[PDB]
RNA sequence: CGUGAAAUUGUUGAAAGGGAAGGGCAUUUGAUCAGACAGGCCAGCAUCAGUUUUGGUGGCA
RNA sequence: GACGUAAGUCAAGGAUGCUGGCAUAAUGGUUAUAUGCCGCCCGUCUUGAAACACGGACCAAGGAGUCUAACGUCUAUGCGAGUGUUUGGGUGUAAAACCCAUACGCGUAAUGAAAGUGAACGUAGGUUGGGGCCUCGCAAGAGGUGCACAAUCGACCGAU
RNA sequence: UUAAUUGAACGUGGACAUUUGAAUGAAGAGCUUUUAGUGGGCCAUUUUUGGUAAGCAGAACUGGCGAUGCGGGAUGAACC
RNA sequence: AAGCGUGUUACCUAUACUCUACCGUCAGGGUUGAUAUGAUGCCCUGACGAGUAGGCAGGCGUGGAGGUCAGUGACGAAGC
């Protein structure tokens, strides 16, 4: 009789999408990435600052 | 006053092509037409008998009758707010086979050939054609291909 | 006393099993979204480190929004707007990018704003403004059984199954996209950002391909 | 504003009820409305729609037309169902013993069917003994053999019947209908 | 007084309110216009085709 | 155009079987966002090479920032623009700290002094004058004199009230 | 000379009126008026649901 | 659906709880006036009417698609290869109601100018569809029969 | 019809099914009968004829006004 | 500049867009071994709503007629 909106109303957010509880608890919306420090080749950087 | 004769406004439509005048070559005389053949219409100005009206230039029809020197063609004509069926008796000079039908029959055989090998292996042979998909990811190497281009050029006159 | 308890308990036994299946599909969808995004990010990095450039795959999906009213529309673009189910202003549908559909977008170009929707914009759109076409009626989704009873024959059992079919243009995108009623968006909450909508995005208007800023614009309407 | 593809508020264009005020036909509609809703038998939905039909839309069905439908193999023991009037046919001299369900029987038709050993029943007796319409045979009479249909679609070269009061020579057998007088249609 | 002599204005909006439609092709089109010699013999070919199927099937 | 942004747009023709690995053409574009950037790129490749967006490809879109966004430098810019009755080349000079902000000043200058819209302007080259005395304009040369020092006479103070009780002054 | 309408008019009473009057939405003021105690009238606060608007702040890429 | 081991609870298929005032012109309605903003005179002909186009000073009463003969489509009803009692006759509680013979009209035969002739080779034909029904299948489906209707090729009747 | 089953046309019997032969949409699809009003048009963009031109006269496609109020162009049939 | 050109935001407000309610229309449905006795009823669901000429539908009113309310009325009908 009344469309209760998900993205609010956490109860309806849990009626749909049972993974919303796992996503909330594991903080998957703020997941850390892995620090990898590869650097661009000389050709890319020299092309970037080229006039 | 206004003139609306049969061959009116056909000055360039019924012209022979440049340096393609004279007698008709014998290929059109040896083509065999059958009831159900898809045919295109292009009137030959050199052959005035058996000749279509200016409306039917560039129209594609279906052979319904085969005569001594001529062919009967079904053509749908848009009259008012609906299409009407039109029967034309056209000599074979103004008739060529439609290449649209010839190309579709190749894909009918090729679909059968792909489906004959289907029951050996490989369900869902993807027999339907598809539109052009967006391009996939690729890596462009600059080996021998370093980017370089100038800016817009200034205005000159060249006169 | 009429086997009511047995048919009562066995219905939640079915409910738990379907909930469990959906839960382990949404965990697998979450993983592959994260896996795909990180692999594209490293694709740009490893091509940069090798002196190359990584050319992104061309976008396979747009979200077209009709930004122009219904009066004074030429016939050919008007017929395309009906074939894309954009029958009123601020209505939106998803379109699968092919050369056949790319030519529809060129003819309705002065009348629509479109571009490439992100997962976030597809998720908020389906969760808030998602409606089903159930026997020619417009039914709010609001439940996995509503999607299951209509798209289950294509494997789409829940609302995330449907969203997965939209963002990843799958084998059943057409059936899963026609099932969705055209989205009835609002007017943008901050406005359009331009004084005049009816120029191209490139000229400083609002229509045309605005490839990635459609996400910001649609979220204001949504 | 909505760019409407189809006409809005369009009625279905089909009868949902008989225009007749027959209190007894309304009970037959009431019984078959219940039957077509609480059963999945296609027969009950077809009969319900036929009970709305207008008089020209249910032409009379001859007993000879009934008897010819009983020359189909395996159709002899089926219950002929006619949503309309069954008339009599003197041109046929032998009639089989069969059960016929109809809205109306003429006195000659009811006499001929019963004298053959058969039975005449109404559509509510049919509903009781064939609730799903099992082993039935719906027969419809010829619609376009009506004289009015002869004049439908009148025009040149169409070979239709002109709307005319007096026939014979001097009545539209001249210029327009023979080449000796102007043209032929 | 003078008036407008001709215009095709609105004549396509009128032709499209009721949907310009193809003439509804059938199986077995009418044999009108077919060659008489072919049609005369095709009648005699159809008779014996049915006669052969009469004896074979019965 | 909250600010202009400078992008490199690198593109190429679409590879064919007969000529794979095309030449990888690159330009520098001043645009408000990456959409206008890619649009302007194809507009200029039309002026030079036989290619359009359908027969071409965008391989790289990289924003370029200033190596030193906070040192005041003298910028020399060449602009080809369209007047109401012809096309004209001109060379102007802007004193600022970034290429993007000089372009912002330059587009304001064309539209103010020549009524030339962004539509009509072709940025030929934006070059920082490397050393002094290659600056040829007196409106920039006057800002390179040693120990420069000027006042700001007639200060106008914006009040936050409609009525003031003091008859305010303009000292500074 | 049954009843005794309206146009039009007289008296009384009320009201408004700086180059027309009349009207539509809303409210003030005046005058006038219906209903209801076995809950009718107007509100205040709390916790929610739906739709929005405006901030503060946190974690990530 | 969520939480809770469960019991049960909850923000989970649409507002409940607590408190105060009044109980009448207080709210509300109506009406007069005032104020803000808006509002050109209706009807007609017209591409276009507030028009410097026409009718209209006001009010009451009257005032304009009717009836008939014949007919087309559609619909309802009665009967049905028939149908129509009411021209007449009988009868009557008397312009009503009730009852009826022979005719006649239309229909059941067409075609030709006419003289005339005059409708089954067949399961009243064949082919393609065709709702419904029957058989087998959990169902999907397959086969059989297929009224109306649609297309087409035949057969028969009359003219030539 | 061919010198000749050589053909032509129509067939009997057999094999093939949801990726059954591009995309998108489908608002139910198709069909019929009957009848009203109308048959003075005009305007805008683009093409275009006569004309020096015209708030001129005449055409093409489309959109409008007519037949339509609402917000804007102070004001206005057609503009946004 | 409260002018001209250009850029950025903020803000104002249509009978337009979103949400909800109510009215009507259309469409799809549910509902009989008590339909908690009105099946032209009750109810569920979705969408839709401009309009001259014109068409159809459902209703309001007037004079008279058959039936009914053993209807109202000089203790005041009709009219105003
Ligand atoms: Mg000519
Ligand atoms: Mg000759
Ligand atoms: Mg706001
Ligand atoms: Mg005229
Ligand atoms: Mg008196
Ligand atoms: Mg008076
Ligand atoms: Mg005065
Ligand atoms: Mg709240
Ligand atoms: Mg008051
Ligand atoms: Mg006032
Ligand atoms: Mg005013
Ligand atoms: Mg005039
Ligand atoms: Mg007027
Ligand atoms: Mg006059
Ligand atoms: Mg006068
Ligand atoms: Mg009167
Ligand atoms: Mg006239
Ligand atoms: Mg008019
Ligand atoms: Mg103005
Ligand atoms: Mg205005
Ligand atoms: Mg415009
Ligand atoms: Mg300004
Ligand atoms: Mg209306
Ligand atoms: Mg009207
Ligand atoms: Mg009366
Ligand atoms: Mg009285």
TrEMBL record, chain F:
One record GO biological process: translation
Classification via InterPro entries: Ribosomal_eL20 (IPR028877), Ribosomal_eL20_dom (IPR023573), Ribosomal_eL20_eukaryotes (IPR021138)
Gene3D superfamilies (alphabetical): 3.10.20.10
Domain of life where this protein originates: Eukaryota
Annotated Large ribosomal subunit protein eL20 domain residues: 5-127
Signal peptide: none
Keywords carried by this UniProt record: Ribonucleoprotein, Ribosomal protein
One Gene Ontology cellular component: large ribosomal subunit
Pfam families for this protein: Ribosomal_L18A
Transmembrane annotation, as ranges: none
GO molecular function: structural constituent of ribosome
Subunit comment: Component of the large ribosomal subunit (LSU). Mature yeast ribosomes consist of a small (40S) and a large (60S) subunit. The 40S small subunit contains 1 molecule of ribosomal RNA (18S rRNA) and 33 different proteins (encoded by 57 genes). The large 60S subunit contains 3 rRNA molecules (25S, 5.8S and 5S rRNA) and 46 different proteins (encoded by 81 genes). eL20 forms multiple interactions with RNA and proteins in the central protuberance, connecting components of core functional centers that are located far apart.
Record HAMAP family: Ribosomal_eL20
Family, per entry: Belongs to the eukaryotic ribosomal protein eL20 family.
Name under which the protein is recorded: 60S ribosomal protein L20
Organism: Saccharomyces cerevisiae (strain RM11-1a)
């Amino acid at each position: 009789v009344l469309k209760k909106n998900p993205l609010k109303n956490k109860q309806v957010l849990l009626r749909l999408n049972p993974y919303a509880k796992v996503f909330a608890a594991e903080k998957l919306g703020s997941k850390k990435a892995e620090k990898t420090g590869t650097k661009p080749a000389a050709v890319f950087t020299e092309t970037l600052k080229h006039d | 006053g206004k003139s609306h004769g049969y061959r009116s406004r056909t000055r360039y439509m019924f012209q022979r092509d440049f340096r393609k005048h004279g007698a008709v070559h014998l290929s059109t005389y040896l083509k065999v037409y059958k009831v159900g053949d898809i045919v295109d219409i292009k009137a030959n100005g050199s052959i005035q008998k058996g000749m279509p009206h200016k409306f039917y230039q560039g129209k594609t029809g279906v052979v319904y009758n085969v005569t001594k020197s001529s062919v009967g063609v079904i053509i749908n004509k848009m009259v008012g707010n609906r299409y009407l069926e039109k029967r034309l008796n056209l000599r074979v000079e103004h008739i060529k086979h439609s290449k649209c039908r010839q190309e579709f029959l190749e894909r009918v055989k090729a679909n059968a050939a792909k489906r004959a090998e289907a029951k050996a292996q490989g369900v869902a042979v993807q027999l339907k054609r598809q539109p052009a998909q967006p391009r996939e990811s690729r890596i462009v190497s600059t080996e021998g291909n370093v980017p370089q281009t100038l800016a817009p050029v200034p205005y000159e006159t060249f006169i | 006393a009429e086997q009511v308890a047995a048919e009562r308990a066995a219905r939640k036994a079915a409910n738990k099993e379907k909930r469990a299946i959906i839960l382990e599909r949404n965990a697998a969808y979450q993983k592959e979204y994260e896996t795909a995004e990180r692999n594209i990010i490293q694709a740009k990095r490893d091509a940069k480190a090798a002196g190359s450039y990584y050319v992104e795959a061309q976008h396979k999906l747009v979200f077209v929004v009709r930004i122009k009213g219904i009066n004074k529309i030429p016939p050919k673009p008007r017929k395309v707007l009906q074939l894309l189910r954009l029958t009123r202003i601020n209505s939106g549908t998803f379109v699968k990018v092919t050369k056949a559909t790319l030519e529809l977008l060129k003819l309705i170009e002065p009348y629509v704003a479109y571009g490439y929707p992100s997962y976030s914009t597809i998720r908020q759109l389906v969760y808030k403004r998602g409606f089903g076409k159930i026997n020619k009626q417009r039914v709010p989704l609001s439940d996995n059984a509503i999607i299951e009873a209509n798209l289950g024959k294509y494997g789409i059992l829940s609302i995330d199954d449907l969203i997965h079919e939209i963002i990843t243009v799958g084998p059943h995108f057409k059936q899963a996209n026609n099932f969705l009623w055209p989205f009835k968006l609002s007017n943008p909450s901050g406005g359009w950002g331009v004084p005049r909508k009816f120029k191209h995005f490139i000229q400083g208007g609002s229509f045309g391909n605005r490839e990635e800023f459609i996400n910001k614009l649609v979220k204001s309407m949504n | 504003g909505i760019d409407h593809t189809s006409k809005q508020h369009k009625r279905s264009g089909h009868r949902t009820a008989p225009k007749s005020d027959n209190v007894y036909l309304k009970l037959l509609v009431k019984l078959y409305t219940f039957l077509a809703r609480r059963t999945d038998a296609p027969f009950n939905k077809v009969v319900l729609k036929a009970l709305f039909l207008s008089k020209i839309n249910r032409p009379p069905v001859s007993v000879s037309r009934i008897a010819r439908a009983l020359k189909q193999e395996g159709a002899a023991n089926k219950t002929v169902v006619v949503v309309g009037t069954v008339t009599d046919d003197a041109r046929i001299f032998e009639f089989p013993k069969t059960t016929v369900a109809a809205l109306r029987f003429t006195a000659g038709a009811r006499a001929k069917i019963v004298k053959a050993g058969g039975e005449c029943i109404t559509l509510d007796q049919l509903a009781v003994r064939a609730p799903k319409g099992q082993n039935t045979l719906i027969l419809r009479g010829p619609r376009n053999s009506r004289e009015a249909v002869r004049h439908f679609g009148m025009g040149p070269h169409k070979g239709k019947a002109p709307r005319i009061l007096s026939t014979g020579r001097k009545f539209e057998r001249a210029r327009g209908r023979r080449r000796s007088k102007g043209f032929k249609v | 007084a003078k008036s407008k002599n001709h215009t095709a204005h609105n004549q396509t909006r009128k032709a499209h309110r009721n949907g310009i439609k193809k003439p509804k092709t059938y199986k077995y089109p009418s044999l009108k216009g077919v060659d008489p010699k072919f049609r005369r013999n095709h009648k005699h070919a159809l008779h014996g085709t049915a006669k052969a199927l009469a004896a074979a099937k019965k | 155009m909250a600010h202009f942004k400078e992008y490199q747009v690198i593109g190429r023709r679409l590879p064919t079987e007969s000529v794979p690995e095309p030449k990888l053409f690159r330009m520098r574009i001043f645009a408000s966002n990456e959409v206008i950037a890619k649009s302007r790129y194809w507009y200029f490749l039309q002026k030079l090479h036989k290619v359009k967006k359908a027969s071409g490809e965008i391989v790289s879109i990289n924003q370029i920032n200033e190596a030193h966004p906070t040192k005041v430098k003298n910028f020399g810019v060449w602009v080809r623009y369209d007047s109401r009755s012809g096309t004209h080349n001109m060379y102007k000079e802007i004193r600022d700290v970034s290429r993007v902000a000089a372009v912002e000043t330059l587009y304001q200058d064309m539209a103010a002094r020549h009524r030339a819209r962004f539509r009509s302007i072709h940025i030929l080259k934006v070059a920082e004058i490397e050393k002094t005395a290659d600056v040829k304009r007196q409106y920039v040369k006057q800002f390179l004199t040693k120990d420069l020092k000027f006042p700001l006479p007639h200060r106008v103070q914006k009040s936050t009230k409609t009525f003031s009780y003091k008859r305010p002054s303009t000292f500074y």
